[PDB]
Amino acid sequence: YVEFEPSDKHIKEYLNKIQNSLSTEWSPCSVTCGNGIQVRIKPGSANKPKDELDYANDIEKKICKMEKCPH
Numbered sequence: 001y002v003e004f005e006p007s008d009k010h011i012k013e014y015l016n017k018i019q020n021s022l023s024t025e026w027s028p029c030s031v032t033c034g035n036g037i038q039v040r041i042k043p044g045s046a047n048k049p050k051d052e053l054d055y056a057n058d059i060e061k062k063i064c065k066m067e068k069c070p071h
Helices: 008-017
Strands: 034-043 059-066
Touching: 008 034
Parallel strands: none
Antiparallel strands: 034 059
């Protein structure tokens, strides 16, 4: 069945997109309408170099829900 949840592949794509502003503060929502994701670096991972961030353990994710997408 259709999952209706954000996929890890797509969240990793967003991490590439916002990598320059990625920090311990939540990112902007990945979308301007409908459902997307916000990401941040876990505070306990703030000392790590960019090339040693584990997706599952060093990155926090949360669903964000924006206004209904217009036609």
